[PDB]
Amino acid sequence: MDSEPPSEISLKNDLEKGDVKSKTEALKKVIIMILNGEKLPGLLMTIIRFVLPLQDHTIKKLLLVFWEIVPKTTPDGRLLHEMILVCDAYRKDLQHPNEFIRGSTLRFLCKLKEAELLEPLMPAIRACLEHRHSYVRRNAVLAIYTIYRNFEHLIPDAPELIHDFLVNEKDASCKRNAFMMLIHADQDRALDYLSTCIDQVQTFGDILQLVIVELIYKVCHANPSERARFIRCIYNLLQSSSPAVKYEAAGTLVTLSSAPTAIKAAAQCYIDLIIKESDNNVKLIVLDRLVELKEHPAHERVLQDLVMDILRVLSTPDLEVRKKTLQLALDLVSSRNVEELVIVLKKEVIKTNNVSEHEDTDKYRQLLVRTLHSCSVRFPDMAANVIPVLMEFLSDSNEAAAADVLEFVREAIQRFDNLRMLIVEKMLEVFHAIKSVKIYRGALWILGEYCSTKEDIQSVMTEVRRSLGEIPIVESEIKKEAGELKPEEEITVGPVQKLVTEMGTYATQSALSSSRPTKKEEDRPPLRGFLLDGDFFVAASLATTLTKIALRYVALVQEKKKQNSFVAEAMLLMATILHLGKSDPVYAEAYVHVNQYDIVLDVLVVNQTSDTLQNCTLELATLGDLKLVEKPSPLTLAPHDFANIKANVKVASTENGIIFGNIVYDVSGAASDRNCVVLSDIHIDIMDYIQPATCTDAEFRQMWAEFEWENKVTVNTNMTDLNDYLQHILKSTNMKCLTPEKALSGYCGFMAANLYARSIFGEDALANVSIEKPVHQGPDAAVTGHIRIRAKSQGMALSLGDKINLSQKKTSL
């Protein structure tokens, strides 16, 4: 009988039957239905009658079982007395020669904090005063303590009965087996006795002595219990810069992340931390101790650095461990992050050296070039390293492989003015075999800026200019680029001037030069030719032309703040980006009142009628996410009764199977068809059910992408900013205004709120409230705001859309 709540009639029958097995099974079936929480008092006389005196342990044990989980509730066969049918003949049970029945009886009897059993539990310590097992003596210290807990904090429970009444706790210390139920409030002499016992311990018992009294002067003295306290005590005597090298903490710690890569990744972190405490700049974070595994002697054999190499990773162990490991290389050794990121990047970025680090997918290659290159932009020393490695990247000599390479290096030159003169000659080489945009773009920029340095350019450019591949974006990049630097410093059959001619043709003009350009018609609609066409005031010469622009870098460009940079090593970053970091007539009148922060729905129940409505009961219901914190409890609604009855309200619950409308309120009365009527007290909305939750800009952005929010409305009374009406109203449809999606200035400055919720509707809810408050001569519609809304199938989107207008209720009875 797993859980069957109607079966009590059969149990009575089964409980006495003249067959002992049946009786045991019955009583067992009662236990299992109560434990789940089901019907049990009908049976009581039957249950109690067979078992009572006997020394036959199994039925007695079963009855003994049922007296610690419901004795108080059941009363057919027990009623209320001092020597109840729980203990009257269980004084026999306590005083049987078999330890088990006595012991069991003692154990339940003393366990209860019952006051209708207080006297019978007190000399119940007799059953276990003699200690036939470790179990008997432990059973005794726990039972005396449980007696002490049960209203006997004074002389009824404190001395000895004949050996224990609160003194097993003392005795246990010096006896062969220990266990101290003495944790609080008990004899001082036993506490003292436990200390002595630390030495003459029994190990289970030591965990009991130890919860009470901890800290040792020793190293130990033995056993897991003492050992477990000991690592706590050690952390005290050296708190300083974490544990560093984990103590006896290490054993539990592995299981704490049994799923399976995460342990190594964590372990790797600690091992890296431990090596050294470095400068602790941007991603140079290694704490713990400065010297404890050093770094870097030149006589150390086979050195520290061997372990450091693991941390430099491509994936060399698996991805979770990889992400931890790349950060960890950066963390022990660099200048900041820059130094060790360049080494690390050199390995990752595409080459002709190894083909286990090159790939023909263009974005990844490109990104890897940008990561290597960002280190230079960060720190100078890296410029010198980067440029020759970049030329190796080029040497791959696939159209695309060159292409990616050329694209970053060209950015580097914008930063690094006439420093990378050397690269230009390498960069031209792979520009001729071509099937893509990227190669043309980049090459034309290097060869263009670099012209003073070289003289090749008609020849290199011209094979490509009459070759094909994909050429949209090529136009833009060649347009600003081709002439640049020194007015007449090249010549192969086209000097720098031919280049300016070319540069202009490629931009949007027409001219025979480099055997004509591939295309002329520019990239995306805004860019066009014209700016540059106007430009080249002084023909490709460092002055105030293309050259200027080329040998200068747009805004601030420093660090790895992503200003001509990309922020570490490209593969590690994907993982970091991913991390969102999300945090019968009846009359009612009613108002909601709050006194001393108690929120209640006031209801007055009125019988305007002369007719009888007796049988009157009042209930507030649990609909779904609405709940009663206590229904109105008066038996009112009688002939010409006016009553004030208070129903307390909650807003947060779990969905019930009954209707999901406004608030259900139920009054009952006389009638047999409609004994229960549902009638209303004032408004509560569907919107309550939504649950508020919040987003950060990353979670908002991810969800924006994840599912559409095209749906918009413009809501009146969003004249005001985010903070005022809009927040308060948004709150009531369990929403909250978080992070921005705005871009403010002297022409821009709609207020933008990123909203989130996680509705109990199987959807989230998100929105952006844009408040069109004029920051221009031509506003949208002046003050008002357009709320762009969604939910996960946009079923709550709509709630956001209208619950940001207005919202107010009041009455004054």
């Binding site: 010297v291 595994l293 002697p297 006589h299 054999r301 086979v302 061997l306």
Partner: protein, 129 residues
């Protein structure tokens, strides 16, 4: 009696350089145990062959691995043990950063907070001294 157990050991002068069951190469000076270096794996001291300028270690292999003994550290610390704190300071220009702070801490443990203050690179160790 020395803290780190001696799995195997060797005498270089009256100083005992030994391996430990922690994989630590330590040296005994003064009845104090200092760690000269950390061994990454389990290693045994074959002997010290002046020719190679090395201590020859062997793993499980009947082959050679070599650790040169860090004499400058050892001499700084040995001098400290003898209570020749000044003498150990002469060694200090050839004790690097964190090692000067450590050797300083050795000097200090033996006694004389001030001489330890001059050698300690780290300002914090100076500040406390």
């Amino acid at each position: 009696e020395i803290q780190e157990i001696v799995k195997t050991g060797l005498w270089v002068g009256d100083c005992f350089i030994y391996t430990s069951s922690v994989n630590r190469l330590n040296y005994y000076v003064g009845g104090e145990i200092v760690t000269i270096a950390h061994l990454d794996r389990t290693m045994y001291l074959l002997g010290y062959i002046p020719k190679d300028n090395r201590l020859y270690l062997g793993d499980k292999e009947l082959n050679i691995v070599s650790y040169s003994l860090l004499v400058s550290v050892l001499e700084y610390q040995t001098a400290v043990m003898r209570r020749d704190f000044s003498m150990a300071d002469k060694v200090l220009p050839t004790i690097p950063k964190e090692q000067r702070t450590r050797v300083a801490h050795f000097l200090e443990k033996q006694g004389f907070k001030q001489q330890a203050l001059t050698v300690s690179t780290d300002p914090e160790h100076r500040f406390e001294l």
